[PDB]
Each structure stands twice: as C-alpha cells, then as structure tokens.
Amino acid sequence: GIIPKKRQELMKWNGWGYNDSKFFLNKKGQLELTGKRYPLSGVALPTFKDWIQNTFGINLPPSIVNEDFLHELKKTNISYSQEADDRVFRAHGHCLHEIFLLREGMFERIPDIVLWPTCHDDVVKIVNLACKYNLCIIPIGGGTSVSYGLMCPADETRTIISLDTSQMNRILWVDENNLTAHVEAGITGQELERQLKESGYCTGHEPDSLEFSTVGGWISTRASGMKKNIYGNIEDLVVHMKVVTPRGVIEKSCQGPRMSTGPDIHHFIMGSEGTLGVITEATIKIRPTPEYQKYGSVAFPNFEQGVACLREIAKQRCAPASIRLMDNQQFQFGHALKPQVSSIFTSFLDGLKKFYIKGFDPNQLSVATLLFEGDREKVLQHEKQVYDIAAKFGGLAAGEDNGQRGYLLTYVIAYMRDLGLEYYIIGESFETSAPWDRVVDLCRNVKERIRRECKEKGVQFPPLSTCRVTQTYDAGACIYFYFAFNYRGISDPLAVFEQTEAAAREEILANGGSLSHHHGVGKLRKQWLKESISDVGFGMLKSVKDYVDPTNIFGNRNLL
Amino acid sequence: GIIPKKRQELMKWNGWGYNDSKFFLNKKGQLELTGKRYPLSGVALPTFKDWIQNTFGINLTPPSIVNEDFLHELKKTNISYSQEADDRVFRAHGHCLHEIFLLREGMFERIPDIVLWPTCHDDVVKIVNLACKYNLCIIPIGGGTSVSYGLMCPADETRTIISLDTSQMNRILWVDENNLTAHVEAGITGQELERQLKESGYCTGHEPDSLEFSTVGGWISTRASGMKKNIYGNIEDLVVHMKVVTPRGVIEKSCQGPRMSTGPDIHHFIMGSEGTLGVITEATIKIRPTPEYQKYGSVAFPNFEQGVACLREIAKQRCAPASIRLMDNQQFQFGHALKPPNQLSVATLLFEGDREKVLQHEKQVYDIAAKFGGLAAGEDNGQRGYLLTYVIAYMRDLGLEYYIIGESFETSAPWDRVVDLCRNVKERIRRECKEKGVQFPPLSTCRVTQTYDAGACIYFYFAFNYRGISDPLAVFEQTEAAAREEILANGGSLSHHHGVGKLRKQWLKESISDVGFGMLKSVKDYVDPTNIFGNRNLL
C-alpha cells in the first residue's frame, strides 16, 4: 500500500498502474489481464477484441545541483536521488502527451533531484533550504495528475526539487469520539482505507486513482470520489490541515467542526495545485465501516429518460452511495466484456438484440449502475426507493451482476490506454459539471463537435465519443466523456488530439459546462481560468501566491 | 417584508425588532408581548414574571461632512440618499449590548455621514466608483443585526463614511425550477425571501433567528447558520453563485456548475469577509420544495451529559432531525416558566418533510434516546421552545428596564470537549461575577443548538442584575472576554456563526495562524488598496 522509493520496481515506468497488470492475448486469442491483482485479473474477455475491431477498425540530461546545498542536505539524513530513472518517473502525470514523451521521446525538463521527507519537520527543512539556495520545489504524491500539474516548466533555470511525499504516510491518530483521523499527506487512498478498516472505520473517499493518489494530492486538486453522495468530496471531508509555505506554517488553532472566523483559509489551499506550499498533514472525517454493500443496475429506453430519472433522484435527495448513467455505446462496451463466447457468424449488434429480447431499442437504451452501502436494513429499503423512482421513467431492473461488473471495471479501464497505444488507438477521458438543464444538450453537442473536428482534421474513422453521468448534485451533474481514435495516417496525431481536446472544452463552456469538475486546471486549462473566475478573482489568486510564495519556490506554474 | 428607508417608521430606534412588539404587563399582571406579529403575541405568560424575580431578584449628533462635487455627482445618479441624523444613527450599530447602551443613554463616537439606498447592482458600481474618485469610506449594511461590532464606524476614520444600505435591493431576479436555484438581490430579508418563494411552492430553509431583518448579503458576509441546517445546509452549502463589487472591479464566476475544481474557491474569499472587501450585490441560492409536514418533539434526560451523549449518537447515526437542541436544567426551567431534578435536561426536536418519513424518523430518534435514559416529554414543549425562538431577543429591552443586562454568545467544539467546556465556561462566569461585585449569582446557561459529525455548536446566555455596580458595562465586557478565554482554553472555537467583526479581532491571528492572517491581508490589499471598505473588521 506504501509507494516504494524506487517506484519502477512496482509500477510501470511508461504507463498506468502495476508492472504485473497488462492486457495481452491469451492462448485462445482472447484479451485478458495478467496478474492476480484485480477481480477481472486472469479472466478471458472473449468478445473484447471484436468490440475493439468494430469500434476502431484495426486488426489485433545532467543533474544540475549546488554542492553547498548537497552538503547541507546530507546533514538532515533526508533521503535523496539524482538518478535519471527517479527523476524521469516524477516528471509527469497521466495526460496522453506525457505518456508519449515517455514512450517515443524525452521531456524538455525533469526534476534535478528527488527528496523523500518522512515528516512535517523534514519538509520545513527542505523549504528553508530552497529559500536559502534559490531552488524550485514541485511536490508529488501519487503522480496521477491529469492536468500537466507535475510538468516542469521548460525555461525554469533553477534547480528543481521533486519533493516526493510517499514516505510521509502515517496515520497519526484516530479520534473515535469525534470521528476524525489525522494523517500525513503522502498516504495513498488504498493504504488509508486498509489501515482504518482494521479499526472498523473508513473515509469512503474513493477516487478511481486511489491506489496511488494521496491525501495531499486530493486536497491540492479538489479531488472527488465515487461515493461522495454519502461521504462528501474532499472539501467536505477535510477538517484541518497543516501547510509548509516559504512564509511559514499555515495551521488553524482548533478542530471545531464549523467556524465563522473570516474567509475560510482551508479553501485558499484546497485547489492550490502545488503552487503555494506543501500540505504535510490533514484531519479527515471517518465513518464506521459499512455493514453491507449492494450493487444494482437499471435500463432506460434512452439516455434522456435516464438523465430525467437521475434528476428526480437528486430532487428527492435519495441518491445511493454511487449512481452512474451510461450512454448506449458504454452499455454496449460493457456487454462486450462478459465471458460467454459468441458464434462468429452472428454480428455484434444482432448478438446484443437477441440477448435482450426489454421492449427497448438496443441502439438507444442506457444503463444506470448503482451502489448502496450502510446498514443492511437501510440499504435495502433505500434500494427499493430508487428502483420505484426509476420505474416511473421507464426503468427496468437490470441486475446486480452488471452493477457489480461496472463497479470493478473502473479500476481496470486505465490499463486500456496502453493496450490502445500498442494498436494505434489514442484517447483520453475528460469531464465537466453542468446545470441539470444543460446536461442532455451538452452531451449531444460535445460528441458532435468531436465528430466534426476529427473528420475535418483528416481522421479516417468517426472517433469513439461517449459519455456518462458520474455524479449528481442538487444543482446539476458531473459528465464524464471518453474520446478515442485510430490515428492511421495522421502526420501529427498528438496535435490532432490536443486540438480536438481543446475544441471539446470550448464546446463544453459554450453549452454551460464548467472548466473542470475534478481534474483541475494544472497547466492544461490555464488559458480559460481568468474567464471562469473573473479578472479580479484571478488577481485574488495571484495576491495569495505573491504573499505566501513571493520568490515562486513552488514553481510548477499551475493555475496562473 | 421590505425594510422601509425610514426604518424607525416600523422598527425600534433603540432596540430590537418592530415597534408594535414589546413585553408589557397585561391587565392581570402577567407578562405578554403586544401586537399580532408572532404566534406568542397577545398570549399571557402567567409564570414568566415569577421566573424573572426568582432568577435576578428584582421586583417589577455631529454634522454631516460631505464634499459638494460628490453630492453633485450623487444627485445626478438619482440614487436616493439621506444626511439626516436619525437615518445615520439607526445604521451606526448592531445588536451588541454596549451599542444598545450608546444608542439609549449616550452617543456613538462616530456615525455614518451619509446613507445611500442603491436599488440594483449598477447603482452599487456607481457608488463604489464615486468612493474611489472622492476618497470615501463605505460600510455596507443589510438588516443591521450584527452582533460582532461589524457595523461600528471606527472613531478615527476621518473620511466621509457612506452607509451603503442594501434594503432597497431586495428582489428575486429568477427562480430556476429545473436546477432548483433562485437568483436574488442581496438585500432581501430572510422572511421576504421565504414568503415569496413559498408562493411558488419553494423555500431555502435557511432560518437564522434574525431572519425577519437579516439579508442574503449579510448571511454570506458573516457565514450565517440557520436552525434547520441539518437539512438545508449553512450558507456555504446554500450559495451556488455570487456577484461582488469591489474597488478593483466585479467578481463573478462564468458558470453555475454545481461543483468545480478550478483552483482555490474564490467564493470562500468573500464568504466571511464581513464587509471588508466589497458589496455582495446578487446571489444564487439552492431551493427545495416546501416540506409537506412539520412535527415537534421533546425528550427529557436525567442530566446534561446524558443528553449530550444522545445528541452525539444521533449525529453518529447521521439521523438528526431538521432541528435538535439540548438545553441544560436552567433553560428547561425557563421554558417551563413560559407556558400559557436540578440536573434534568431537555432536548427539543423539529422534524420536517413528508409525513410518513417524519413519523418513521421520530420513532427512530425516540428509540436512540431511550438508550441514554431519554423519555418523551411531549410535542407541545418542542413546539413552545421553537416558537420562543423569535421572541427571546425582545427580552433584552425588558431586562434593561429592570437593571438586568446580558448577552448570548456561542462557540463550536469537538464532541469530546462539550461537557467540560459547558461546565468550565459556566463556572468561570460565576467566579468572574463574584470577583467584580455582582450581588447575585448571574444567570449562566447553555444549550447545544447544532450537531455535526465532528462536534457541536454551544450557545450560552449570561445575564445579571447590575444593582450597586458602578461600571456595569465594564463588568459585562470583562466577564464576556473572560468567558471567551475559557472557551478557547477548553477547545472551543472563536465563533461558530456570529463572526469576528471588531469584537474578536484580537484572537483571530492565533485562530488562523500568522500566515493565514497574512493571506487575508494580501487579498484585502489587492481588492481594496485604499481601504474604501473600512469597517476594520477581521484585520
């Protein structure tokens, strides 16, 4: 559960996830995941190749560092490395461009040195040395950023420290009276839940990156998790934090559950994306481990009816732990991942239709997956409430097995990038939040802008462009898109990708969607920020950065 | 529901509330509230006199200095204004005890020079521009209900002070029934907002005790909390969007997405800013269908600790009703005295929602409560407790007629500090009063008004007969400061909801850290480099 210092021992140096986990063709020519890490690991996916084929049309730099600083660093006993593999591993997150530069290229700039502090006091020492020797610090936790938040600016001439938090990973206390846990910021989501569970508790904060993403990362990026309906997003979960900045340590003097003591400075730090200082410790709300979990799924005649149903569920404030509504292409894709071998003489579509002979169109139908957790009595009553609401919108119970499957798929989908890259398929997921009344139109127009933009950029085939609704709020929804294409005969595939991704974002903003729901701004969405938060708002951000970090030690250049 | 420009037409110039609403002795010698405005109005309270006697042992203007080029430009805007003394004085204070004395039997060091009534966002922009041009100071005012000296004009402010009154900027702009949000002007009062929305079948459910007069703008500025936050949220959960006029320009996000990751949330730079950065002119707030049904309740416990433990369990099972308040023995006796064993405690309950869910919920709560020795004590108690909510503020003016002074104060604290904090704060008030010559042991009582996952809001009342003290305000001021020191020393916060204003400024830096304080200052100096927004709250 602890990230080791030499990460490549465990994790892939050139893509997502663990070294022991990749898609390969088995001895029957069926896609399958190696290893035994996930419940889908070692399970043949006999229809998956076909769905890939049908969908995409393919056949299956020296360490520049001051010796005085070095010398002082040795006295601290803080572990460090100037090794290229350590530096490179920490020079990127998980944006598509980054993964290409790992594979077929090299980064313009990487950290000069990697430090592993093990506690708050180590971080204070490091920041003090950075003030003294004019060093730039870029913090890293899990390295899961999808916003270019870890990329080293190419023209940064100072020595860049990668301040790796992975060895600051302790739970410091569990306060069972107040249901809070105070933890060091480098603890990963899986390690955090694992240790709390041994005492009968959890946070319930479950981003899809939880295997590697950290408490400090979550706070920095305003992370959102699958079960936020019950447990809250990161801003609802964090009760307290400690932050080391060049100006000194930020920390409130008490742990009162709610205050009126001026503008909440916790929100000056949350979303700061490594531009102000290092979050070293935080107190986070915990809950007793749920007695009981129940999966579920519901089919709707179309997406629009599914959206209307999600809205009503939000309106009655009876959303389960997790509810996600997927469009018909994702419904199909999920169909394509089950274990029963088709006949080769019956098509994909004709195979689906006979299988679900619902009075529904199988090219229109959408599916919501559901997760309920809590006390078994409560969960079961609540499941019946949601299913009764769904019945009113044409909804039909589609079984716990799809829900259970959908929920497992989430930790596996990231492993599909690298598979795609082996076979000329590139893509990325992206997200927005939008008012309830813009959701349908926004999804339709964005998927369409992407088709028009690919066609016009010489993309041979119509791209995969697909969506689901992943979160519901009172005032709207999170919409999560996937965009993918075969880059067969494009001169500059990345450019085409990059430009199409920007055009989708322009379309999103024009349809009432936000700049980001959860991934953040990093360096990827900087150019829209000022418009999103207004000029004065941007200058307020700037004024906090100039005060706390006047010499721009925290020089990742995100946000501003 | 609109506050008139001449507030004294309807509201007491020297105290809380409406002119038609005061406690008096009726024709049977029983206390009673005059007028028809509350459900308790014109209802005799046979044993309230008796309770008071037992408890406290009693029986029963500077000129307006204004630049004429400024006034000349101001006339051209057609924005209504006044330099009249009664308008300026009315807006020179809130509802702290010391201010109510300077209002009654003295005079304020400093009052606004001129009162402006903008009716919209654009008016406000014009005003702020004129303040930049003529070097004027602006103190915003909504309901004037601050209990933190947040409206007090600094004595040495030599610039012309504008009281920028938001009461005529009070309209609902639109109600989006698809997204359940209402976009409103910031001067609307809570009662007028709920009244209008209720005609369309909606509510916000944000019900601070001051809702008759407090405004949307005020709530955002002070981080207000309401009685039913368990269902609807506090102000930070309710506000989806806002528009703010600062000297640097207008702050406003470009979209109404329900939740974002776009850097530090700048809504939180303005929420809690207490009039020091600019004017909140408009806000979008979440609404809900009006609940079908309300039910009251009450539970008796053998003592306060047991009640507290039960509240904690209720919070732990995340099954709090709309409101749950636990009062100590003294407040139980008080409440008993206001119908039409020395340690026994009582919780009042308010459930609201759909009838069948409410009844189900109510059973669940009584069940939990039985495990801490909790016994159902009737719906009528609960009802009465909640109907007293809006009349307690009228009791100050009663007490002042009979040499009784006091104030309420509040904190939030972790669950494991609540009982010790209550006991220690209450004893520190006794100790301090005796040492300063207060003849009779003060009233010193508490209740838990809100529960959260990580703790509770604790609400105190302190009051005494000041018979034979020579500086009774100084005794009060010092005792309240002492109580605050005791709260902080027992793990309580500087404020749960009242805010800091000028009253708690001295503790702020310690509460939020030096660098934290420095972050607030840097925002102020950016948005407002010449301190046009110069009430001097917080910093």
Ligand SMILES: Cc1cc2nc3c(=O)[nH]c(=O)nc-3n(C[C@H](O)[C@H](O)[C@H](O)COP(=O)(O)OP(=O)(O)OC[C@H]3O[C@@H](n4cnc5c(N)ncnc54)[C@H](O)[C@@H]3O)c2cc1C
């Ligand atoms: C497969 C996959 C699934 C994902 N699922 C989700 C999801 O469900 N929800 C979601 O919100 N996000 C998701 N993400 C995005 C990402 O995991 C989150 O934004 C996460 O919060 C980053 O955490 P981390 O520890 O990896 O931070 P990193 O990626 O290490 O760094 C993030 C930013 O924070 C800074 N930083 C990191 N730690 C600290 C610290 N202690 N102090 C100060 N600054 C710091 C870095 O400098 C950088 O700017 C996903 C990403 C991937 C690749």
Ligand SMILES: Cc1cc2nc3c(=O)[nH]c(=O)nc-3n(C[C@H](O)[C@H](O)[C@H](O)COP(=O)(O)OP(=O)(O)OC[C@H]3O[C@@H](n4cnc5c(N)ncnc54)[C@H](O)[C@@H]3O)c2cc1C
């Ligand atoms: C009897 C009584 C009961 C109360 N009950 C509660 C309660 O339950 N919960 C609670 O939280 N508080 C309560 N309070 C305190 C008070 O009502 C709240 O702080 C309320 O939010 C203040 O609103 P207001 O419009 O009265 O603002 P005012 O008191 O007019 O102003 C408060 C501060 O905000 C500034 N301001 C006002 N409007 C604006 C604007 N539009 N833009 C920028 N700044 C502005 C003022 O300069 C001042 O600094 C109570 C007060 C009293 C007297």
Ligand SMILES: C[C@@H](CC(=O)N[C@H](C)c1ccc2[nH]c(=O)[nH]c2c1)c1ccccc1F
């Ligand atoms: C799954 C996706 C690639 C991708 O978007 N990966 C990133 C790292 C990712 C994967 C899952 C995420 N969940 C979330 O909230 N943010 C997420 C970001 C993909 C793979 C293969 C082909 C196309 C494609 F879009």
Ligand SMILES: C[C@@H](CC(=O)N[C@H](C)c1ccc2[nH]c(=O)[nH]c2c1)c1ccccc1F
């Ligand atoms: C009721 C109280 C006076 C008082 O504190 N009134 C203020 C204005 C008040 C009244 C009600 C409040 N509710 C809340 O959250 N904060 C509140 C503040 C009182 C009256 C008479 C004698 C003593 C005394 F403490």
